[PDB]
């Protein structure tokens, strides 16, 4: 019945959580911000078995509870760490070479400041104030206006614009690449028909000079998709060598057009077409193709979607249908139980 549902809450929250709590710490020891998550989640998960929250069917926990101190600590840590991660990602997207410039002991001080930032509203709110601890809706003096504003409005707004600018900057980078390649593609195609309709060496040399200049420029520019790999990666060397032969075919076609004969220049330019479409065009056909490489978006989305409903029933009642009590622990326990699987899923 009610006791059975409450009894299994502590076992599900602790045993599942503590299994990944030590594992996350061990894995991190063997991602400075994630080290805080493995640490912060472990503190209020270790003290959860002390009071299994099953003393409601023992009149215990007179000067202790999992609610006030531990949930305030957890919410503050999660919000501060999510804001820090979002700000770091936004800075990295928006040229972090000025804000940080790879200056991540400086990040250790900020990492340890999450508890310091937590120790201004989470632990500082250590008081009963008619909380659970074993008229309105708990709003006589504990209306949690600050808890809702800092817990929800501060974290959601900071995170929401942070990835919005991250995806916006990513689109502008990619956009600045497809247009340049398309421009270089357009001049290669446009100048090729003039050569195929050439009448004298006066123009077939001029057309090739423009096409050589475009190929050299396009080689420096990164491809639209299949990008972000290391410059010395075989695929990047495979792409770069694809233009070291295209220009080589330009030099051979232009050198034979410098002597004076032009009937041969089209044939050399023609054989440039058959190799430019078979390999270069196929490369860009699969190119011009979103989500971060990690599960940081997943953990942030899950937390804000499970703890916002926790505070939704906090002030929902106004001065009956009080179903937010049994689901109170379950909603938060799921997030703690979702912490190690998300970390495992991120590692894959």
């Amino acid at each position, epitope marked *: 019945v009610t006791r059975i549902f409450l009894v299994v809450v502590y076992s599900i929250v602790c045993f599942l959580g503590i299994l990944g709590n030590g594992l996350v710490i061990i894995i991190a020891t063997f991602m400075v911000w994630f080290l805080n998550l493995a640490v912060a989640d472990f503190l209020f998960n270790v003290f959860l078995p002390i009071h299994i929250t099953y003393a409601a069917m023992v009149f215990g926990t007179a000067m202790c509870k999992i609610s006030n101190f531990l949930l305030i600590h957890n919410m503050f840590t999660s919000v501060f760490l999510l804001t820090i991660i979002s700000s770091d990602r936004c800075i990295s997207v928006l040229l972090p070479v000025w804000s940080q410039n790879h200056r991540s002991r400086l990040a250790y001080m900020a990492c340890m400041v999450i508890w310091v930032l937590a120790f201004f509203l989470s632990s500082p709110s250590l008081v009963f104030r008619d909380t659970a601890n074993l008229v309105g809706y708990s709003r006589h003096m504990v209306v949690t206006v600050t808890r809702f504003l800092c817990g929800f409005l501060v974290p959601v707004l900071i995170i929401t614009a942070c990835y919005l600018t991250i995806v916006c900057k990513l689109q502008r980078n990619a956009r600045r690449q497809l247009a340049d390649l398309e421009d270089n593609w357009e*001049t290669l195609n446009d100048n090729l028909k003039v050569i195929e309709k050439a009448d004298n060496a006066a123009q077939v040399k001029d057309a090739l*000079t423009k096409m050589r*200049a*475009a190929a*050299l420029d396009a080689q420096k520019a990164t491809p639209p998709k299949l990008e972000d790999k290391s410059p010395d990666s075989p695929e990047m060397k495979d792409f770069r060598h694809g233009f*070291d032969i295209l220009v080589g075919q330009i030099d051979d076609a232009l050198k034979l057009a410098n002597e004076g004969k032009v009937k041969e220049a089209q044939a050399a330019a023609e054989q440039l077409k058959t190799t430019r479409n078979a390999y270069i065009q196929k490369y860009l056909e699969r190119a011009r193709s979103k989500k971060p490489d990690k599960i940081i978006v997943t953990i942030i989305i899950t937390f804000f979607l499970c703890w916002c409903p926790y505070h939704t029933l906090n002030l929902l009642e106004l001065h009956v249908f009080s179903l937010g009590l049994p689901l109170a622990t379950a909603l938060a326990i799921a997030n703690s139980c979702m912490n190690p699987i998300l970390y495992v899923f991120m590692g894959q």
Partner: antibody, heavy 124, light 109 residues
Framework: EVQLVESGGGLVQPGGSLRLSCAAS????????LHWVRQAPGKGLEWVAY????????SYADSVKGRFTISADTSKNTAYLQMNSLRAEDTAVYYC?????????????????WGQGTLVTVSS | DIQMTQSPSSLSASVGDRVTITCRAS??????VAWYQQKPGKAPKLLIY???SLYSGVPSRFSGSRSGTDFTLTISSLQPEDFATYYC??????????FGQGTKVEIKR
């Protein structure tokens, strides 16, 4: 090391012939092309002609096309520049430059190991 | 076949000053220009190649940028030894090399 030597520069009657020998020890003429750049006294540098002894693709400047006749011999590591029907406006200091081969780094480096350059003057 | 221009053809900077020299290529030319420093009565020496790199052996004070079809060379400091004529040269093919008019640097007084 790379070292270029020129010779054959001196007084020339207008309409005469001259021969400048771009001796280049160190590297090999086969490895790198040899461009001839001339600088009229009191003016900027001007390109004249180039030779690539690996295959042979001589192509002179527009103003000196046909009159000059550039050549290169790997057996002597030289790049001669035959002068024909020399005029009074061709007086300058003729440098002998070097240049790499596509692809790779050597092409992207422009004329780097210039020779000393021997002046040629034309007067009546 | 292309025309290469340098508006600042006579500079009167002093010791320790910074000199910016602009170079504009008429046709579409990729990052394929170079800058030579010709001391009087001597052969020119390469300073900057590919419009961004630095030659092996040049002092770090010489740097260049591209910023579009134009090109620029910036000198951080002007030592007394560094006072000569600087030429802007492009190179797209072997037969399409065109040199700039030339920038001369003198002593301010």
């Amino acid at each position: 090391e790379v070292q270029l030597v020129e010779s054959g520069g001196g007084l020339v009657q207008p309409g005469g012939s001259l021969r400048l020998s771009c001796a280049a020890s160190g590297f090999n003429v086969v490895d790198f092309s040899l461009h001839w750049v001339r600088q009229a006294p009191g003016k900027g540098l001007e390109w004249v002609a180039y030779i690539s002894s690996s295959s042979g693709s001589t192509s002179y400047a527009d103003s000196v096309k046909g009159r000059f006749t550039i050549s290169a011999d790997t057996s002597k590591n030289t790049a001669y520049l035959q002068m024909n029907s020399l005029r009074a406006e061709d007086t300058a200091v003729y440098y002998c430059a070097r240049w790499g081969y596509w692809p790779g780094e050597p092409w992207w480096k422009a004329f780097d190991y210039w020779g000393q350059g021997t002046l040629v003057t034309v007067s009546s | 076949d292309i025309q290469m221009t340098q508006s600042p053809s006579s500079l009167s900077a002093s010791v320790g000053d910074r000199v910016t020299i602009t170079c504009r290529a008429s046709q579409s030319v990729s990052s394929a220009v170079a800058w030579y420093q010709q001391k009087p009565g001597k052969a020119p020496k390469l300073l900057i190649y590919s419009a961004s790199s630095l030659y092996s052996g040049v002092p770090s004070r010489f740097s260049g940028s591209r910023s579009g079809t134009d090109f620029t060379l910036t000198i951080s400091s002007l030592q007394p030894e560094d006072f000569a004529t600087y030429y802007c040269q492009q190179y797209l093919y072997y037969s399409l090399v065109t040199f700039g008019q030339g920038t001369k640097v003198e002593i301010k007084r």
